[PDB]
Amino acid sequence: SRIAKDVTELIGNTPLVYLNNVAEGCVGRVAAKLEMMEPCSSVKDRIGFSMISDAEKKGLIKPGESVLIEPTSGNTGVGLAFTAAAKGYKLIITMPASMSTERRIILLAFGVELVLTDPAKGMKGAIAKAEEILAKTPNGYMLQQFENPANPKIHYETTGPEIWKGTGGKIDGFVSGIGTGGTITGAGKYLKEQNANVKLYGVEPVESAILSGGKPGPHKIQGIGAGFIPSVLNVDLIDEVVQVSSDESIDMARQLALKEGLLVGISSGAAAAAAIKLAQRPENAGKLFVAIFPSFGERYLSTVLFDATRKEAEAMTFEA
């Protein structure tokens, strides 16, 4: 074994674990890829690093000179933040002021120069502000997670190989919730190259199933269902799109903690619900499905994921 040079070398190589009691009724087999175990608890730690690293190698940016910028209210900000702190890059992040205080604290802790935007203008307002800052800032450099090729590329170079090796080449289906689409595109392409028969299942919200001809809409599956097809997403690789409801995902997320000891985010619940359904189809008896569990559940204590347990906690009194 050895000592890592810095935190960026601790990224990736996350474990696989079989789902047991929650997978009742499956004739197929489901293993979860735990991105929740990344140094900062989410799959985004991979692209936060890859987008910065790729820019560096291309000579497009330099530590202490370039100013990183990105409009993000989710895990991508965190992934970029810890990697920027380690490599010595100034990082500016824009997000709607409506975002919870906890989401701002974590970024601040890493030294991010946070810029909040009109809560009424949503992410559109955050994106406008970012571009406005880019125009102002001389050595500014926007990452653009939805457009950056380095996003799916890191998944093609690490995530995919890890899954192939971790399953001994026995994976039959890869189940991935789609946010930027980088994971399913990069890892999926790699897996397809190892065995053309491997099936790629993209997961999206029933309330915003745009890949299925649905119309964009609000949902609670944080991390997926952007409401549009991301530039980095390659829909040709997708063999089947599986829709899961917000309630399904929330319920599975809770069941995963209660029965598997896996405290996961709601998008992990979505991936699990999708994968479990597939593993229940008689035609898939004996097959091995790998579902990506994007993030750890602790980062979502204030969201709807814990509403039920939260009110119960708040309503209890001490026993003498």
Ligand SMILES: *Cc1c(COP(=O)(O)O)cnc(C)c1O
């Ligand atoms: C980014 C993310 C996803 C989806 O992964 P992509 O690689 O962007 O398609 C799912 N859940 C969470 C919590 C995420 O942060």
